[PDB]
Design an enzyme around this catalytic site. Structure first.
Site, PDB file in Angstrom:
ATOM      1  CD  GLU A   1      -3.253  -5.775   4.041  1.00  0.00           C
ATOM      2  OE1 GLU A   1      -4.080  -4.965   4.516  1.00  0.00           O
ATOM      3  OE2 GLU A   1      -2.049  -5.497   3.853  1.00  0.00           O
TER       4      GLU A   1
ATOM      5  CD  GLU B   1      -2.918  -1.182   2.285  1.00  0.00           C
ATOM      6  OE1 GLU B   1      -2.862  -0.330   3.199  1.00  0.00           O
ATOM      7  OE2 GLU B   1      -3.899  -1.936   2.119  1.00  0.00           O
TER       8      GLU B   1
END
Ligand SMILES: OC[C@H]1CNC[C@@H](O)[C@H]1O
Length: 802
Positions: A473, A397
């Site tokens: 994720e 991220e």
């Protein structure tokens, strides 16, 4: 010669100590301890520390010191020390000489100390300064020398650590070809004629192949070596058979072996098919993975072989077969256990890159420009030989997703991984939609790692068919063990600072696991998922305290909420209702699970929801003997509220992965009967518990190694006279350990408490608490454990140390 542990006999002290790097320094009154050690978990909890990092002192200067003397036989020998990990910003001194300055807290580093040692037989002092900063982590990092340390005495001609690299370029039913590389160092001031032997050894010690090289090593030189060997009829490393060979390198000098280096070798074929998931040894294996942070609950961030092994056992019991090291290199012990337990690994290197994540001003971003190359290469160099590693990851991220030139960093980082390990593909946790598509970062990656984008799998795969896709994720639903809120609705926070175990509460970027199962089924080209998380971890108490992608670092509005709720199990590994939901999707052994418990005295005559998770075909629910309906999984869907970040039109999802009833509550018992092919395959009964009356102890292991590191996790349950768990019990339990062991920590999976982890007492949390008993090094014998709580019957158990 083979290395020894350097963990024994250290001194430690917080604060700034001018002159602490010098040998002559008054450390007589410093606290004595052994490594590994994490001073942050010692606490205390303080509202001045952000609940995002657990509300514990994970920053500030501290010093370690150790006095050590080498035998006189070390004269003319090489001496090196390896720190597997130190958190963080570590400076190492040997007799006043600075030898290490490494900011990264999740990487192992080695340093030659031969030039700085005093004469053999005289005392040496090593000094370690750590300066972790606040506002540097999105989770609990701990602080100190939290991984194992090692000392090795070598011949002046020896093999360089982490430079031996083996792989299998060609595998057939008849043979496997083993590509080999190593580096020998000659620290002698003269030429050294040696023979470098390279052997492949079976587990039974059979030399299945061997080559050698006669060479004259120049003085003060390094010599790279490449070899190619063959393994006829190789026994493959596999999820069903984690067999490993061993590659042994021997430096023979004057006919005598003077240095022996060993690395693992697992023979397996890896193939990532863009339209057909992940294939291991010529058959598809669905990636049923979990994310884990490095800490071990009450033990803090310290490494412990048994603690790690226990976590992997519990995750395998859930049906998982893969672990993502979020978001940092793991300990060597984790990777070693994954090798032997057949667990596939996604070994991740970084969280953020050079651009800081919001309000995390002191993270790795400050060191990225200078250290990203060495830190990424060192992670790969340390674990590229382990067959459990199936892919690397370069970030998670990262903020560069929304930068025009962000793709360049990804390409450059992936180039570095390919250079150090040309045999593995690289992934990266992409989260900012549609930025990682628009700005080309996903185009650069070997494997496109999607974070919480299950409902976009079909659209993304159709626009980019040749992409290799994985859910790096997934979900991020939160819950608390033993907590149930009524009615089943999607609120944001609760007054209790806990989350309902019906598994519907999700942050704005998150969704229930049902939506991941559904999109993985409807898009079979995606190889699998890595849920967030398998275990609860310290810090990030979302939805309490704050949300990760906000620009506020202190999360203390909901104090004392300081631990996570993302885990399928809690901080000590107690199974949540989420655990059985994943077991219903990931295992084949017949099971059935029902929630909630049946102790609701304020609900007599009122309606209550009942959920059932199973891998069977049907489940029939009974309340005090009366049937409430025989439902069919997949046909009788459960409508659950959702809120998707990049699809605001979806408000609900009819999940075929749960079963729901709504019955009138009356005390007594409930029972679920699981049917497959019209016959009973699993039955679970939950009775209304009486008044709390006694303590029950359940040690997972009763036979321990007397090494000072082996642990026994003793489940503590508060039950009634009939043994039924009291679902709301919070009794203070007192523990006594006599014999060849002692208490090392306690816990109970409570995410919002400031109770000590190092104590001989602990409150039950919704019926359960955990007592961690440790062995004592060098003393074998019985370990008697006694648990006591007022107004309850005490309990005793006996363990054995060998
Ligand atoms: O749902 C929480 C997760 C969001 N994605 C990054 C993880 O480290 C964690 O913060």
């Amino acid at each position: 010669d083979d290395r020894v542990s350097f963990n024994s006999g250290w001194l430690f002290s917080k604060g700034d100590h001018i002159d602490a790097a010098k040998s002559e320094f008054e450390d007589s009154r410093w606290r004595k301890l052994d490594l590994p050690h994490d001073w942050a978990i010692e606490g205390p909890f303080d509202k001045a520390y952000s609940a995002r990092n657990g509300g514990l002192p994970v920053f500030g200067t501290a010093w370690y010191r150790k006095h050590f003397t080498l035998p006189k036989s070390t004269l003319g020998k090489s001496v090196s020390i390896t720190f597997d990990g130190a958190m963080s910003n570590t400076e190492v001194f040997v007799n006043g000489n600075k030898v290490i300055s490494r900011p990264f807290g999740y990487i192992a580093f080695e340093f030659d100390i031969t030039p700085y040692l005093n004469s053999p037989g005289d005392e040496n002092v090593i000094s370690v300064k750590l300066s972790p900063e606040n506002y540097s982590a999105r989770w609990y990092s701990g602080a100190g020398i939290y991984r194992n340390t090692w000392l090795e005495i070598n011949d002046k001609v020896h093999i360089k650590q982490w430079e031996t690299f083996v792989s299998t370029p060609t595998i057939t039913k008849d043979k496997a070809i083993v590509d080999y590389k190593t580096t020998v160092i000659n620290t002698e001031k003269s030429s050294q004629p040696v023979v470098i032997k390279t052997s492949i050894k079976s587990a039974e010690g059979v030399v299945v192949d061997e080559v050698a090289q006669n060479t004259i090593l120049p003085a003060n030189s390094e010599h790279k070596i490449q070899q190619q060997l063959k393994i006829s009829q190789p026994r493959l490393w596999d999820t069903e058979d984690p067999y490993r060979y061993t590659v042994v390198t021997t430096v023979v000098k004057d006919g005598n072996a003077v240095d022996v280096n060993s690395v693992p070798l697992g023979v397996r074929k890896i193939e990532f098919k863009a339209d057909d998931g992940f294939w291991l040894n010529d058959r598809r294996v669905q990636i049923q993975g979990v994310c884990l942070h490095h800490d071990n609950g009450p033990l803090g961030a310290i490494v412990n072989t048994r603690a790690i092994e226990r976590k992997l056992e519990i995750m395998k019991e859930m049906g998982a077969n893969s672990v993502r090291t979020s978001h940092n290199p793991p300990s060597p012990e984790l990777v070693e256990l994954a090798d032997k337990m057949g667990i596939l690994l996604q070994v991740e290197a970084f969280d953020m890159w050079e651009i800081e994540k919001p309000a995390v001003v002191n993270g790795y971003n400050k060191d990225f420009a200078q250290w990203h190359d060495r830190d990424l290469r060192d992670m790969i160099k340390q674990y590229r030989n382990n067959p459990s590693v199936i892919m690397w990851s370069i970030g998670n991220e990262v903020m560069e997703q929304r930068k025009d030139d962000g793709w360049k960093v990804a390409k450059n980082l992936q180039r570095i991984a390919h250079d150090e390990d040309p045999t593995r593909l690289v992934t990266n946790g992409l989260s900012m939609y549609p930025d990682f598509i628009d700005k080309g970062m996903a185009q650069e990656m070997d494997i496109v790692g999607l974070n919480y984008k299950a409902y976009k799998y079909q659209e993304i795969k159709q626009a980019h068919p040749d992409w290799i896709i994985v859910g790096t994720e997934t979900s991020s639903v939160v819950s608390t063990r033993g907590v149930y809120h009524f009615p089943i609705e999607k609120y944001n926070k609760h007054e209790s600072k806990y989350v309902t175990s019906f598994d519907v509460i999700t942050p704005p970027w998150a969704y229930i696991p049902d939506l991941e199962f559904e999109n993985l089924k409807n898009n079979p080209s995606v190889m699998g998922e890595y849920i967030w998380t398998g275990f609860d971890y310290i810090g990030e108490p979302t939805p309490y305290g704050g949300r990760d992608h906000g620009n506020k670092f202190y999360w203390n509005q909901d104090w004392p909420a300081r631990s996570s709720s993302f885990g399928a199990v809690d901080l000590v590994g107690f199974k949540k209702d989420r655990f059985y939901l994943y077991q219903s999707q990931w295992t084949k052994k017949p099971m059935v699970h029902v929630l909630p418990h049946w102790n609701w005295p304020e609900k007599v005559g009122e309606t209550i929801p009942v959920f059932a998770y199973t891998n069977a075909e049907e489940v029939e629910l009974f309340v005090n003997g009366q049937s409430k309906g025989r439902k069919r999984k997949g046909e009788d869907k459960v409508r659950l509220p959702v809120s998707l970040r990049y699809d605001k039109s979806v408000k609900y999802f009819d999940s075929p992965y749960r079963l729901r009833w709504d019955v009138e509550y009356q005390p007594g018992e409930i029972k679920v009967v699981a049917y497959t092919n019209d016959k009973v395959v699993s039955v679970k009964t939950v009775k209304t518990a009486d008044k709390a009356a006694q303590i029950a102890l359940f040690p997972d292991r009763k036979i321990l190694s007397a090494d000072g590191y082996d642990l026994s996790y003793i489940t503590v349950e508060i039950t009634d006279t009939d043994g039924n768990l009291v679902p709301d019990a919070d009794n203070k339990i007192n523990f006594k350990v006599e014999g060849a062991g002692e208490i090392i920590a306690v816990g109970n999976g409570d995410s919002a408490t400031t109770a000590p982890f190092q104590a001989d007492y602990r409150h039950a949390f919704y019926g359960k608490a955990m007592l961690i008993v440790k062995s004592n090094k060098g003393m074998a014998g019985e370990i008697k454990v006694t648990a006591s709580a007022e107004k309850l019957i005490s309990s005793s158990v006996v363990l054995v140390s060998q």
